[PDB]
C-alpha cells in the first residue's frame, strides 16, 4: 500500500496549507478509482489517497474502472473499462442486483447512478452498465476488514490505517475469519517466493531451495534470512515444502514476514471476553494473560543498526583500534583483537561496540593533575576516547558486522578512511505499554497482564486471553468487531446444520457445503457480500461440544465464566469469542525517554540531543500559562532559567545538588545582561532604576 498511493501534494502540484477544504472532500466520481475509506488521519486527509482494486490507469493518466455492459436488460459479460468522463453520460447499474441465471433484472426497476452523481431509481431498460462486483470503491488495505458494512467510516478508516503498522511475529499464524483479499495480496506483495516454472522439489534447506523443472535445467531460490527491514523489523523467510512435493507455476514455496501458507496473517487469534474487569481495562486499556508471554504468542524480533566512521582530522587521522585511553580491562573482554566486537556477544546498555580514538591535540595540565599522573606513573596521552557505545536502553546479541575501508577500495564519502556498522538483534515480548489493535480500528495500550491462574476461565478451565471493555463498543459504532467475535467462535468450534430432513429457512440460501465445518475451520466474508445478521444466529445454535458433549456458548453467544480471583462464578453470562488482534509498532521501548543532564547546543545554550543523546523535553507556552494560572512563580522561573539557558546557573545548581547544599535562589538570569548590550548596539541608553 505504499505503492498504489496518490498524493495531490508535492512538486508541480498544490501545497498543504494553500489548498482549501475542497480537494479533500470525496467526489461522487471517486467511486471505483480512489478509495474514500483509506487515508491518513493527520493534516493530510484527502490529499493522500490510495487506488482502488479493479481500477487501471489510462494511457494518458486518467483512472479507469471495469463495467459489464447490459443490453436490453440482459447482463452480458463484455467488460469495458470506462474512464471518468464517459461514465456520467451513461447510466450505471448496481453491483448486487437480482440477476436470474441469464442477466435479466428479475425485478422491474433498478438502482442507478445518473450523470450528475445522484442516486436515482430507474426501469430495467435504461440500465446499460453494471459494476463487476461490490467492493469496487474499496482499496486493497480496506478490502481485508470483515463486516465492513457494519463499521462507521471513522473506525473503518482507523482500522485500514492501523494494518500497515503491524509487526511480523515469530510464528505468523493465519486469521480464522477474513476475506478473499488475503491469499491474493500476499503473492503480489513480493515477499512470497513463488515457484516460477512448474517442476518438482529436489532439495530444501533453511538457506535455499532447488526445483528441477520438467525440462532439464533446474532453478535454485535463495531465501533471505534475518535481513533488517527499513523500520527495524525482521525479514525472515522459510520454505513450506518437502523434498518430494510437486509444484506448479504460481504456487507458493516460501512464506514471508507476516504470511502463513502463502497468505496474509498480521496477528493472532485470541480468546476474548467483553466484560469490564475490576478497572484494569478502563477507557481503551486492555488486559492480557501470561500465556501470551510464556508461549511466545506475541514475541517479535527487532534488528537495529549502529554505525561509526573514522576520518582524517586536522591533527591526524582517527583510528579504530582496541587500544584506548585510561580505561578498565573488563570493558574489553568482548572486543576482538582489532577493535569491533565479536558476533554473538550479549551487549547491554552502555557497553562498547567499536574501539575508536582521536588525537587530543595539545594542552597544559594544572598542577593537581600533573602531581596525579606522576603518582600513578601513567604519563598522559594525546588521544581522545571517542568510541561507539550502545545507546540507552538497548540490548540483544550482535548479529552482523560490516566494514568498509578507503585503503581497500571500499568507496566512501570525502575524508573517510574507515566505516563500520554493527547490527544488534533483540526478541521483544509483549509488555504493558505496547499498543494492540484489531481490524475494526479498536486500539489500546496494554495496562495489566494477570497470571494465567486469575483470569475468567470457561466452565472447562480455559482462561480467556484478552479482556476487552464494553463501554467502547456502543458509542464508537463499530459493532463489526462483535460479529466476527461471534463467528470467530463458530469457525473455532465447527458446526453442522441439523438440516437432515430439510434445510432450515435461515440457511437455505447462502452456500451449499457450508452447513458443516470441522472444528478450527477457516472461513471468509467479502467486504459488502458476506455473512448476514440472520445467519450467524443460525450458525450459533450449532457449536459442537469440545470434548464431552457440553455446549459452552448458548444461543445468544454468551458463556458462564468463573472468576479466577474470587473463585465464584459471575452472576450474568458474558460474551466470549475468538478475535484476531495484531501487535502494532508503537512499543514503549521506542517512546520512553529521559534526561538528567546531556549535551547543549553551542549557538543557543538550550539542551540538545541526537541518536545517543537524551534530547530534553520542551516546556511550551500553554504550560507557562498554566504555571502562571497556579501562581507558581519559582517553578516557572526555574523551568525558564536554570534548566534552559543560564550556563552559570545549571552548573551552580548541579554542584549544590551533588554537594547536598541548598539550591541557590534564582536571581536575575544572565540572559538579561545581553538584551542591554543588544540595545546599546543601537545607541539606546537603557538604565535600571
Amino acid at each position: 500500500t505504499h505503492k498504489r498511493r496518490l498524493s495531490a501534494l508535492g512538486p508541480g502540484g498544490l501545497s498543504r496549507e494553500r489548498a482549501g477544504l475542497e480537494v479533500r472532500d470525496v467526489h461522487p466520481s471517486h467511486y471505483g478509482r480512489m478509495c474514500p475509506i483509506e487515508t491518513p488521519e493527520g493534516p493530510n486527509i484527502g490529499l493522500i489517497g490510495s487506488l482502488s482494486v479493479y481500477a487501471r490507469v489510462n494511457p494518458f493518466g486518467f483512472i479507469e474502472t471495469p463495467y459489464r455492459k447490459v443490453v436490453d436488460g440482459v447482463v452480458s459479460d463484455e467488460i469495458v473499462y470506462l474512464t471518468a468522463d464517459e461514465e456520467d453520460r451513461h447510466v450505471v447499474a448496481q453491483a448486487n442486483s437480482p440477476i436470474d441465471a441469464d442477466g435479466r433484472f428479475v425485478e422491474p426497476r433498478v438502482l442507478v447512478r445518473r450523470k450528475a452523481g445522484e442516486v436515482e431509481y430507474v426501469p430495467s431498460s435504461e440500465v446499460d452498465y453494471m459494476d463487476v462486483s461490490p467492493r469496487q470503491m474499496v482499496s486493497v488495505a480496506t478490502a481485508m476488514i470483515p463486516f465492513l458494512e457494519h463499521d462507521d467510516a471513522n473506525r473503518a478508516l482507523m482500522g485500514a490505517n492501523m494494518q500497515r503498522q503491524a509487526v511480523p511475529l515469530v510464528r505468523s499464524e493465519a486469521p480464522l475469519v477474513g476475506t478473499g483479499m488475503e491469499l491474493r495480496a500476499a503473492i503480489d506483495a513480493g515477499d512470497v517466493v513463488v515457484a516460477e516454472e512448474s517442476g518438482v522439489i529436489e532439495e530444501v534447506s533453511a538457506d535455499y531451495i532447488t526445483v528441477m523443472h520438467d525440462n532439464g535445467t533446474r532453478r535454485t531460490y535463495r531465501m533471505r534470512k534475518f535481513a533488517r527491514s527499513n523500520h527495524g523489523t525482521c525479514a525472515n523467510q522459510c520454505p513450506i515444502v518437502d523434498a518430494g512435493d510437486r509444484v506448479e507455476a504460481g504456487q507458493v514455496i516460501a512464506d514471508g514476514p507476516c504470511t502463513d501458507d502463502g497468505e496474509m496473517a498480521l496477528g493472532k487469534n485470541l480468546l476474548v471476553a467483553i466484560m469490564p474487569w475490576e478497572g484494569h481495562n478502563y477507557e481503551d486499556a486492555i488486559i492480557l494473560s501470561n500465556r501470551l508471554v510464556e508461549e511466545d504468542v506475541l514475541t517479535s524480533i527487532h534488528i537495529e543498526e549502529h554505525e561509526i566512521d573514522a576520518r582524517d582530522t586536522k591533527l591526524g587521522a582517527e583510528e579504530i583500534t582496541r587500544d584506548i585511553p585510561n580505561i578498565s580491562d573488563e570493558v574489553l573482554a568482548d572486543l576482538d583483537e582489532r577493535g569491533i566486537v565479536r558476533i554473538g556477544a550479549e551487549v547491554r546498555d552502555g557497553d562498547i561496540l567499536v574501539g575508536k580514538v582521536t588525537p587530543k591535540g595539545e594542552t597544559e595540565l594544572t598542577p593537581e593533575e600533573r602531581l596525579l599522573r606522576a603518582i600513578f606513573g601513567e604519563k598522559a596521552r594525546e588521544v581522545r576516547d571517542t568510541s561507539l557505545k550502545v545507546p540507552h536502553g538497548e540490548s540483544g546479541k550482535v548479529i552482523g558486522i560490516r566494514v568498509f575501508s578507503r585503503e581497500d577500495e571500499d568507496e566512501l564519502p570525502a575524508g573517510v578512511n574507515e566505516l563500520v556498522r554493527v547490527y544488534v538483534a533483540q526478541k521483544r515480548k509483549i509488555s504493558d505499554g505496547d499498543k494492540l489493535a484489531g481490524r475494526h480500528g479498536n486500539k489500546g495500550v496494554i495496562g495489566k497482564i494477570l497470571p494465567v491462574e486469575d483470569m475468567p476461565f470457561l466452565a472447562d478451565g480455559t482462561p480467556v486471553d484478552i479482556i476487552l471493555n464494553t463501554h467502547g463498543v456502543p458509542r464508537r459504532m463499530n459493532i463489526g468487531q462483535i460479529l466476527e467475535t461471534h463467528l470467530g467462535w463458530c469457525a473455532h468450534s465447527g458446526w453442522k446444520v441439523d438440516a437432515a430432513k430439510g434445510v432450515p429457512d435461515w440457511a437455505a440460501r447462502l452456500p451449499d457445503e457450508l452447513l458443516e465445518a470441522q472444528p478450527n475451520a477457516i472461513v471468509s466474508t467479502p467486504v459488502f457480500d458476506g455473512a448476514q445478521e440472520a445467519e450467524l444466529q443460525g450458525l450459533l445454535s450449532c457449536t459442537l461440544p469440545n470434548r464431552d458433549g457440553d455446549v459452552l456458548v448458548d444461543a445468544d453467544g454468551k458463556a458462564m465464566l468463573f472468576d479466577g480471583r474470587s473463585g465464584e462464578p459471575f452472576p450474568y453470562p458474558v460474551t466470549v469469542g475468538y478475535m484476531y488482534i495484531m501487535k502494532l509498532h508503537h512499543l514503549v521501548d521506542d517512546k520512553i525517554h529521559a534526561r538528567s543532564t546531556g549535551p547543549y547546543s553551542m549557538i543557543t545554550q538550550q539542551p540538545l540531543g541526537g541518536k545517543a543523546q537524551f534530547g530534553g523535553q520542551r516546556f511550551g507556552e500553554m504550560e507557562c500559562w498554566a504555571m502562571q494560572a497556579y501562581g507558581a512563580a519559582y517553578t516557572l522561573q526555574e523551568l525558564l532559567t536554570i534548566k534552559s539557558d543560564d550556563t552559570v546557573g545549571r552548573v551552580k545548581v548541579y554542584e549544590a545538588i551533588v554537594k547536598g547544599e541548598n539550591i541557590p535562589e534564582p536571581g536575575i538570569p544572565e540572559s538579561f545582561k545581553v538584551l542591554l548590550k543588544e540595545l546599546q548596539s543601537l545607541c539606546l541608553n537603557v538604565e535600571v532604576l
Partner: peptide, 27 residues
C-alpha cells in the same frame, strides 16, 4: 481459487466474480 496450492477458505459470498483482481502492482 485460481491458485495452485492455496488453502481452502470457505466463503460466505453469494454472487460471482466475472472479473478477477488485476496485477495489483501493475500501476
Amino acid at each position: 481459487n485460481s491458485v495452485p496450492g492455496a488453502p481452502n477458505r470457505v466463503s460466505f459470498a453469494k454472487l460471482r466474480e466475472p472479473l478477477e483482481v488485476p496485477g495489483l502492482l501493475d500501476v
